[PDB]
């Protein structure tokens, strides 16, 4: 009954693989993991990926202790610039001598489409990792017990 759920790269991978393997579901873009959802919360390091001949779409990468996911970054059309939250990451990366950092990212995924990443914030505290893990486990338990 909630459209936003927190999960990590491995959960993304298994959900996508299961949806592709078994497409006999409802004719709607919503995924199915103890319900329908469109938003996800994940904390992992981000790194730019250099695409070719692909100006409108910017390809990302989120490697984590469980796996890696590919996301697409969209930019404005009337003028060619970057969203402020990603310009902040770019300037931080150039300032800190090209060192990647973990980020707290919120991203939207739909089946038969790429995974769009809307916003993220750079995290500098390590306790956020444990916070995200515990929140993930608690939310999964809540969803499982609310299904029944």
């Amino acid at each position: 009954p909630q459209i936003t759920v927190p999960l990590n790269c491995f959960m993304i991978n298994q959900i996508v693989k299961a949806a592709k393997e078994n497409p006999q579901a409802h004719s709607g873009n919503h995924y199915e993991w103890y319900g329908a959802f469109e938003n996800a919360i994940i904390t992992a390091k981000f790194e730019f990926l250099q695409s070719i001949n692909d100006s409108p779409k910017i390809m990302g990468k989120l490697s984590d202790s469980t796996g890696c996911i590919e996301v697409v970054i969209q930019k404005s059309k009337m003028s060619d610039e970057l969203p402020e939250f990603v310009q902040a990451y770019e300037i931080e990366l150039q300032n800190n001598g090209n060192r990647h950092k973990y980020v707290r990212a919120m991203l939207k995924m739909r089946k038969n489409a790429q995974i769009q990443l809307l916003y993220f914030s750079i995290v500098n505290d390590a306790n956020e990792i444990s916070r995200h893990g515990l929140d993930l486990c608690l939310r999964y338990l809540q969803r499982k017990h609310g299904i029944e």
């Binding site: 909630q2 936003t4 927190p6 919360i41 919120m106 916003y119 914030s121 505290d125 306790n127 956020e128 444990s130 916070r131 515990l134 929140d135 486990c137 608690l138 939310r139 338990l141």
Partner: protein, 187 residues
């Protein structure tokens, strides 16, 4: 020590509550989507002027004090607070609104926030205000939320107001999540 409740718990208790009931809660959440369609501020006197007599040419005169008063601007903001569970609309008053304004921009002084907003609006500089409000999006905090089951215009309604806003720190929130999950596993 304090006890923290979730947005869904607050919603269920507010619904089950009878008219005229109040209760306070402390929630880990993030502010989002500040609304500015309605009037952003109102005028009050220093002596708590209940009625402010409007005149022309920026003239003001309180009734609770009966002196020629310089108008005092009080900032009124509407936004939405939301945890991982649910989202609700909240009322933000002058003190908290000024606190967030000074936090996002240290240049503007605490009580100077309302005057700064009024000056920008009257001069016709709304892009700056919009960008400042947008910079506050997904700002994690610790919220003290109170709900009131009150009747307005012979219509029942529930109103949510934020009382305290504190800087967030992950340690005790993670501890609370850990004990909650351990309790759930034990049960």
């Amino acid at each position: 020590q304090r006890i923290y409740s979730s947005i869904e718990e607050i919603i269920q208790q507010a619904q089950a509550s009878e008219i005229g009931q109040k209760k306070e809660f402390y929630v880990y959440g993030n502010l989002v989507s500040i609304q500015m369609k309605n009037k952003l501020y109102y005028y009050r006197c220093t002596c708590q002027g209940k009625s402010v007599l409007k005149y022309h040419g920026d003239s003001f005169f309180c009734e609770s004090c009966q002196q020629f008063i310089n108008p005092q601007v009080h900032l009124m903001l509407r936004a939405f607070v939301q945890d991982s569970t649910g989202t609700i609309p909240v009322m933000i008053f002058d003190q908290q609104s000024s606190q967030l304004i000074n936090q996002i921009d240290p240049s503007i002084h605490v009580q100077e926030a309302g005057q700064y907003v009024k000056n920008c609006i009257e001069n016709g500089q709304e892009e700056i205000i919009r960008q400042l409000f947008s910079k506050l999006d997904f700002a994690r905090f610790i919220f003290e939320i109170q709900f009131e089951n009150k009747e307005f215009n012979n219509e029942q309604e529930i109103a949510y107001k934020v009382l305290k806003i504190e800087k967030e720190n992950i340690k005790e929130e993670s501890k609370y999540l850990l004990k909650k999950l351990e309790h759930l596993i034990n049960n």
